[PDB]
Design a binder for this molecule. Structure first.
Ligand code: UTP
Ligand code: UTP
Ligand code: MG
Length: 350
């Protein structure tokens, strides 16, 4: 019923009204530690040893990505892995090719037969097909794919989080909030990460991604199909952006404003747009504001444009044809908005 507000789940309410310190006391130091632990080298080595024989004359490289690597993971987080077999890094696949699916199918048997791996699930129908498998010596669940784009946006998030740590604290908070609100079926960890990034861009605390991707005599694009996946690694001092120390008061204030902002955002006409990094980016206008490679890509592939006829539009800042919240329904959006409203209220000072 659209005339009634969806009540914030008690599990979320107890954590919000509870101290924000308890939300980080343990979570931030764990997340920081998990950016680099020796277990990941063991996983990398075991994965290469396992898979090389199946692809004998081909280069093979493992790329770690996802929340562990960016610094918002916890001990139960998966480890996301991109296996590059035969220099596919720079090849864009909107949906996986038959050749990609064949390689993933071949990889399945290796994990099945190995004593060191428990095959959990082989997901073939997804946008990004993945093999979910537990590395038994470490106990870490690995999510293995053949698509480089997540690794690319992981390196962007890592730069953002390291340059402006407030961002990372906020993402740890909002990730946990999403879980306690039971919103993860429609809004992913990565979606809410992009929302935090966009919010802070509007506070002049983060640069637009477009500004990091100027193509001139000094800087050339790394391309994955039509997408520019590199970025200038400028100091924030050179960018002219201040770098805050995240304290509990500071985080609490930015979080209240975050939820207040997305509580009142006009999802019918505007999109969350970390590429442009400015306020009030119109759904009606975004496609004309993108780089010429986008226009050329869609002109040749009109079925592959960003999906804008959706309740909630959050555009990936690198894979510009991807609305990462395209699965949010009308009622799921109302639920999100209602939860944001109630959360910002509980974060007010007296
Ligand atoms: O490289 C990736 C990409 C995505 N994912 C994660 O896989 C999960 C499922 O991905 P989606 O949320 O996109 O839903 P889906 O499987 O039905 O595929 P589409 O609707 O987009 O067509 C999501 O939680 C995503 O974050 C990865 O783990 N690795
Ligand atoms: O829509 C999507 C979803 C996911 N991804 C890419 O897949 C990465 C892994 O997608 P995950 O679903 O594993 O999320 P996450 O690792 O960021 O956080 P967890 O819930 O696992 O702790 C994401 O961090 C992103 O790089 C996309 O590129 N697009
Ligand atoms: Mg992950």
């Amino acid at each position: 019923m659209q005339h009634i507000t969806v009540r914030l789940p008690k599990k979320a309410r107890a954590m919000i009204v509870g101290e924000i310190t308890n939300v980080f006391k343990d979570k931030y130091p764990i997340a920081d530690k998990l950016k680099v632990i020796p277990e990941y080298d063991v996983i990398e080595q075991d994965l290469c040893k396992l898979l090389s024989p199946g692809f004998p004359k081909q280069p093979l490289r493992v790329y770690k990505f996802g929340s562990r690597i960016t610094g918002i993971g916890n001990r139960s987080s998966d480890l996301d892995l991109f296996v590059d077999i035969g220099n596919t890094f720079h090849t864009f696949e909107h949906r996986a090719s038959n050749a990609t699916v064949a390689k993933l199918r071949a990889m399945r048997k290796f994990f099945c037969d190995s004593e060191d791996w428990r095959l959990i699930n082989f997901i073939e129908q997804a946008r990004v097909p993945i093999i979910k498998t537990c590395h038994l010596p470490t106990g870490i669940e690995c999510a293995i794919c053949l698509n480089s784009m997540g690794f690319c946006n992981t390196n962007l998030l890592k730069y953002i989080f390291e340059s402006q740590p407030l961002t990372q604290y906020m993402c740890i908070y909002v990730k946990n909030w999403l879980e306690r609100c039971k919103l993860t079926e429609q809004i992913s960890t990565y979606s809410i990460t992009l929302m935090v990034i966009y919010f802070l861009q509007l506070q002049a605390l983060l640069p637009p991604i477009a500004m990091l991707q100027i193509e001139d005599a000094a800087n050339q694009a790394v391309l994955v199909g039509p997408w520019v996946v590199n970025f200038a690694q400028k100091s924030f001092s050179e960018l002219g952006l201040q770098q805050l120390k995240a304290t509990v008061p500071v985080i609490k204030g930015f979080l209240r404003n975050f939820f207040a902002y997305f509580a009142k955002f006009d999802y019918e006409h505007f999109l969350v747009c970390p590429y442009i990094g400015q306020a009030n980016v119109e759904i009606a206008k975004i496609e004309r504001m993108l780089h010429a490679r986008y226009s050329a890509y869609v002109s040749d592939n009109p079925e592959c444009s960003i999906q804008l006829k959706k309740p909630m539009v959050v555009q990936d800042p690198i894979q510009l044809n991807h609305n990462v919240t395209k699965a949010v329904t009308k009622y799921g959006l109302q639920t999100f908005v209602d939860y944001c409203q109630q959360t910002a209220e509980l974060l007010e000072e007296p």
